[PDB]
Design a protein around this ligand. Sequence first.
Ligand SMILES: Nc1ncnc2c1ncn2[C@@H]1O[C@H](COP(=O)(O)OP(=O)(O)O)[C@@H](O)[C@H]1O
Ligand code: BEF
Lengths: 765, 58, 409, 52
Amino acid sequence: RTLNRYEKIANDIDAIRGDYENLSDDALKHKTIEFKERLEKGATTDDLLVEAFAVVREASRRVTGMFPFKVQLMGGVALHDGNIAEMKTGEGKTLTSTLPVYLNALTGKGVHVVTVNEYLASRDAEQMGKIFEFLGLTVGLNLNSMSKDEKREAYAADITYSTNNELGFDYLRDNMVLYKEQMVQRPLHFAVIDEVDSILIDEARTPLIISGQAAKSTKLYVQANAFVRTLKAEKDYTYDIKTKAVQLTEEGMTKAEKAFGIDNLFDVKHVALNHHINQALKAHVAMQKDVDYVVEDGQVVIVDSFTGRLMKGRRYSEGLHQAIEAKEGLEIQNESMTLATITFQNYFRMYEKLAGMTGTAKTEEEEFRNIYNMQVVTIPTNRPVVRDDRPDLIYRTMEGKFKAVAEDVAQRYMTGQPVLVGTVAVETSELISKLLKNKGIPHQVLNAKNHEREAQIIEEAGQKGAVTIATNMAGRGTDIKLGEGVKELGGLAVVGTERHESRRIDNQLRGRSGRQGDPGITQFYLSMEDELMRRFGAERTMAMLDRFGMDDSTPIQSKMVSRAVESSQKRVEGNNFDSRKQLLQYDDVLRQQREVIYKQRFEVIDSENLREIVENMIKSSLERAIAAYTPREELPEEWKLDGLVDLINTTYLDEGALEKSDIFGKEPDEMLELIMDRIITKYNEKEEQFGKEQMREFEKVIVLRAVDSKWMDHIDAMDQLRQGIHLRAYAQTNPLREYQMEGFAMFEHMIESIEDEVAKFVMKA
Amino acid sequence: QRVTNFFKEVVRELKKVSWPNRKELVNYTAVVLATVAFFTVFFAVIDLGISQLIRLVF
Amino acid sequence: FRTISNFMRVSDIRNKIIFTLLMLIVFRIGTFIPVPSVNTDVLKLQDCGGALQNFSIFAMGVMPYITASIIVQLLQMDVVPKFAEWSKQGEMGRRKLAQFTRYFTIVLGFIQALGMSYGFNNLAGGMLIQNPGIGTYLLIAVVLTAGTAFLMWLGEQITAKGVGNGISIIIFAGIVSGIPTILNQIYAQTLNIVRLLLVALAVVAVIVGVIYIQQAFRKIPIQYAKRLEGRNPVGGHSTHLPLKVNPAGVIPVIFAVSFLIAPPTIASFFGTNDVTLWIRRTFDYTHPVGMTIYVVLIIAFTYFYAFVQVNPEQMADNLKKQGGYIPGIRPGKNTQEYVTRILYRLTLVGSLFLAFIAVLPVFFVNFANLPPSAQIGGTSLLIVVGVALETMKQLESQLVKRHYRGFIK
Amino acid sequence: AKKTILFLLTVLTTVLVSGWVVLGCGVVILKTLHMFEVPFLLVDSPHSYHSG
Ligand SMILES: Nc1ncnc2c1ncn2[C@@H]1O[C@H](COP(=O)(O)OP(=O)(O)O)[C@@H](O)[C@H]1O
Ligand code: BEF
């Protein structure tokens, strides 16, 4: 077993703690100095482990008044080995991210502590930064609003606190620089990841895309808007609700053809008009206003699907954001164009040692073991969980559920107990807010649109008699500390309102109730016309829901609807599993290609003389131009060498240097040496003419511009191939092998294009 | 006459099929004949050796 | 060569081809391991007998798993609706269907082991199992179903850690292991050198014909109007929907031999008669009336199975369901009728090719006086060609994974 | 309905596998044993952080 090793090391840390207590301050900062000296001299980070953890415990007390328990030391040792410490939600997973961060921050290579959003990153960075800046290490905190100089000074600190989005985007913007000293990140060393399930399992379903803006279109967005707005919800389109997909019908296609003057909407001449009618249809009926975006000062701001926060830089792609902006009469902005792309799997798998801690990982041990080779270590709880965890209450309608949840928080407000209601949308939270305005209950609400007052809401949400309504914002890390006299009456009744897409997310909400041995009550109120049941519930049970009746004063007591609820949630888990797995293997293809190009682009950035790189590009393009003429199946003296002399004079040797008598039907090697010697003397003339240093800046600009433009075009061509791939599974093959073979052919055509562009731009200019 | 119209449509459809070229046909036939020859020789050698070993153990 | 040395040069590819050859050796030691409690018979003396099939562990082969798979695939098509919902739900339903195929094939291997044991007893005339009783027959039935279970686990092993699909490699191994005894009979016949050269050039010619028809796709163009397609096109690898010329596979021949040899089995289940003798003479496919009804059944079952496997209505609803459309064709019912017309013409060509392949060896045995255990090019030829090509393509995809060059070199 | 046809095909296949009870004297049954292969297995909104 591995657990008994961690208990033996935790007992060793207690033994050393026996001597570590009476050391004065300014004799512990010297202990960090001594640890760096011993780590430089001959030691590793394992031996120092025992001593280092004891040091942090003493430092922790003096800075914070919190002493680490023994299970926090077991979590620190399990995080140091590269494993996933599953400690229960509420059991202090922020001091156990202080022990191995200190131990692996001593060498100087730098530790990235990832969290889910910026409230938790700033929250952890202040307190743990007090602990670390006590001990003589630096702490940086990397946010979205920082300039590149402040980000470069944040990653130059010993410990960096950031979100996962900012780490991914700083990585992708490090490989779009023009100089080596514009990169912000250091070489990647050690990532501790708070809430590993949310980052590596949940939101690794989606990629990080960085896109610059192309030229604007506005005419067809407004035309497709004005068409789709008059379109008769059941007769001219069908909104599939199982997967949120909207299509026209035959009356809809006929009205689309008669409103635009075209004859067939499904030509190849009108792929653009059909694309605009499709995206205006999706933006009109499949996307609702306060659920998955907002309007904020004349702009559409999308609300994050996982965290429920405003993602104020991100925009919907494939022309959907402009269709939403045209839906509400806002100004339509320029179309994007993907520059760089990565996944959270392939980003967190370039990190040389990757750890993590979470509360709800034991469901996903096989996924943490297959993809990342990290094993979930389940760690004890130091105090038993006395959180009263009541079962669900299924109702028949949404208004019955909301009347019942308002009556529950009304009866809990009367005794002074704090309630935290938990929704997922920004409109159901204001629906229950207006259900609690009348009935006269003073509450607070933490939507996506109420992000500025979050700390003052969370500081008050555990006091005697405080009601909070909270979306996904306060459901993953929010630490509601109980007030005065509030533990005695069962502190922080958490009241759910729907079931989420996994068991881990609602186990996290119940975890907001619990909080290390303090009492708490959770309760989930459910409906049968929920979004989860409407989308994913099986078609068999709906007859029985008709059977149950209609008064909705009391919940359903049956095991049929409970089986339906759990089966629908397990279907959402299975769908997300499959989507995650196929995104993983298709970005494994694109990961091999991206690794090749990003490595070689970086080694043409910091190369002090890139003459040999450009010369190999000219030589490879030259031999491909030789073999593209003079075909080796054909016998010589028929090889149409006049076109070869024309092409070489147009592309390499200034229109006069090559004539047909110099080559005259040789074998390709000696004529290749002749053309290569004429190219190398023209290039050496240009090098001694231009200047040794200005030539390198010139051809660095040429090489980087060619690599960047052809790689953008390759990212977009690989996305269109990834669309057509399953149709290739119709003819009985598997489509992943077709994707790998087409991706390799397409990559090599791209690189031949890069070499041809660089050769003709260096030798004809 | 629908049947001769149908066979005219069948020959037009056979024009639209993407048949393999000459190079892929000789490469594939080399792979098929080489795999059958190798596995035939491999299974003959396996059968002879295992039968002789079984006869040696009796 | 170059590509074979390329396979040997890489360590991962050579590791998995060596693992595949090891598990094929493991499968091939089992063809000599006899069934216990049968061994005391004329099987050590039979040299009218089996002589091809003989006997062993894995006498079933993987044929219970083939029958289980084709039966549950025909049951998915609106016959047991539970299987339809399991297919429509996703990958968890695919695991449910795979475990159903495993328990279905244990059931089927059991009852076919009973059938084949009593049938080889009756072919031998009784005197092949000493003490013919319930306990020994149940023992050898559990033994043959254990053989099928070990072969299916072996196939899963060699598809997880070896070259290609496992069941296809094991079926191909059975066919090409049957080859050298046929070569032995062909040699021990010799009746000239010109007969061998003409029949071998005809064998290589029909191998080229099978490569030609098996690797031909009618590629319907598909236009997805859910992404911009803006200012980054080349035009080479556009999205398409490939239909094969032979979509059905080789399963038309299993339905045709079932419908051909079931009435002689019924008529011999009854016993000898005059109309029984007429049926047994009529439904032999070495005769022109039987061969005509064999060819008609192959064509009819090729049409039925090509419309089961491609399913134009379900693929048109599947194309409307996510964006795509054929350029020109309105994506509801008109896409279904367009791809149905393409399927009618393409399946006519593929069905005629299948019928000419399946009755080729009786023409070869008549017009080329081979020993009649040869069957040079039945559907064994199609299985051999298919498995050899897809194992080669899987190894080629691993090679192109290892070839990423870069512009610097 | 096509259900009857599907059922008929399944029953015929079952009869063929379990009708190995009389082997002549089989000139088709061993052929049937070695000559068939397995069938082939049957067939939201993306975002982008605009910076550069
Ligand atoms: N050694 C300790 N002594 C007392 N309180 C502690 C100790 N360690 C952690 N805590 C408290 O437990 C609470 C749990 O909060 P947090 O660390 O956010 O939970 P988690 O580790 O689940 O994220 C914190 O408020 C912290 O004050
Ligand atoms: F990582 Be914690 F439960 F704030």
